Amino acid sequence: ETKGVYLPKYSAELPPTDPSQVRVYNLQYQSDTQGNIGQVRTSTHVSNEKDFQKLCDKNLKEAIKLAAQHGAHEIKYICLYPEGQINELSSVQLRGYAFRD
């Protein structure tokens, strides 16, 4: 199960959009966060390394859902993976920034 929060940067609320309309980019530069309308963080527990990219996709699905609910047409994101031995507290995390377009 995938937890998720959306943190709006502005109190102005935009009309919701559909998840299929959200364009998706890898967050690469510090300058990439400029102009965002909010942040999104999602997380899923992981017990096997073979599931990293699937769990990142699960994280991204929840992040797109939250961003679309707040009207964003774009997300730039990175998945964070557990460092070292995987245990009962390990999770694949996602940190993203939502954009009006």
For this entry, resolution in Å reads: 1.8
Give the count of domains, the chain.
1
* Residue pair 99/36 in contact by the 8 Å Cβ criterion: yes
Rounded to an integer, what distance in angstroms lies between the CA atom of residue 82 and that of residue 90?
Answer: 6
Alpha helix segments (H runs only) across the chain: 52-69
- Looking only at the bridges linking them, the beta strands covering 74-80 and 23-26 are parallel
Range of the domain at 22: 1-101
As to burial, measured by CB atoms within 10 angstroms (0-12 exposed, 13-18 middle, 19+ buried), residue 57 is middle
State how far the alpha carbon of 68 is from the alpha carbons of 29, 50, 85, in Å: 23, 29, 35
Method: X-ray
Can you say how many angstroms the Cα of residue 9 is from the centroid of all Cα atoms in its chain?
Answer: 15
